[PDB]
Amino acid sequence: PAPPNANDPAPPN
């Protein structure tokens, strides 16, 4: 199942 695209970038750790 192809995961949905992000709405916006995740933050770095």
Partner: antibody, heavy 110, light 113 residues
Framework: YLQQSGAELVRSGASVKMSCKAS????????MHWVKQTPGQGLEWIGY????????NFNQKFKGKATLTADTSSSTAYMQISSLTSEDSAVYFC?????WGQGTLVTVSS | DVVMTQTPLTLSVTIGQPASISCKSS???????????LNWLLQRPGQSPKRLIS???ELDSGVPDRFTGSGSGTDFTLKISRVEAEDLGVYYC?????????FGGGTKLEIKR
């Protein structure tokens, strides 16, 4: 799928805490956003939490008022808003990946 | 903040008519990973929003192929090839590149019958 908690009546100056339970996608892989819908149906971004590492980022307007947390063991996100005033009566949504919650209505009134 | 200007304010369309909605951002939405984080949403009357399109042009699962998204940089368009009755509601664009995240003002699509 995002399931939000029920509507709230809260007094001016008090706080409210609402929840958003996630299923059917990887909770920890996407920012969890909270969004206020204004009476004229504009949408206003409050902030997000990234449940993979807890990092939050906020709209400057809500800094010092909003607190965002995320429980990865139960895949639930929480938003607290403190010091409520009349302008905080609104529907609040959570949103993450392709999904939106159904909204939580908050009425600020004594 | 990056302003998202959506036009028109209202679309009054008949069933089968094409429709298009424009979203212009006040700054480029190209992010440093090479992606452009421009999403389109539909909120039908009485419901929560639903995402239709992400990354400018990529349809979400279940969205009819009558919908297409295009654009780059600051100028974006959502097109409906032929409107159906269930397409009514308010469409919003929203950008995920800049802080704060921001939304367009909405376009209300109403059906003439």
């Amino acid at each position: 799928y995002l399931q939000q908690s029920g509507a709230e009546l809260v007094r001016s100056g008090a706080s409210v805490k609402m929840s958003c339970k996630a299923s059917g996608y990887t909770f920890t892989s996407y920012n969890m956003h909270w969004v206020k819908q204004t009476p004229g149906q504009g949408l206003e971004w409050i902030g997000y939490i990234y449940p993979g590492n807890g990092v939050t980022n906020f709209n400057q307007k809500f800094k010092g008022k909003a607190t965002l947390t995320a429980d990865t063991s139960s895949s639930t996100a929480y938003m607290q808003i403190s010091s409520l005033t009349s302008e905080d009566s609104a529907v609040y949504f959570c949103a993450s990946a392709a999904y939106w919650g159904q909204g939580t209505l908050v009425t600020v009134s004594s | 903040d990056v302003v998202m200007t959506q036009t028109p304010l209202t679309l009054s369309v008949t069933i089968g008519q094409p429709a298009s909605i424009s979203c212009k951002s006040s700054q480029s939405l190209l992010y440093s990973d090479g992606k452009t984080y421009l999403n389109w949403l539909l909120q039908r009357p009485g419901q929560s929003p639903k995402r239709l399109i992400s990354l400018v042009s990529e349809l979400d699962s279940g969205v009819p192929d009558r919908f297409t998204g295009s654009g780059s940089g600051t100028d974006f368009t959502l097109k409906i090839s032929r409107v159906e009755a269930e397409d009514l509601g308010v469409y919003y664009c929203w950008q995920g590149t800049h802080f704060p995240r921001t939304f367009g003002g909405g376009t209300k699509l109403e059906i003439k019958r």
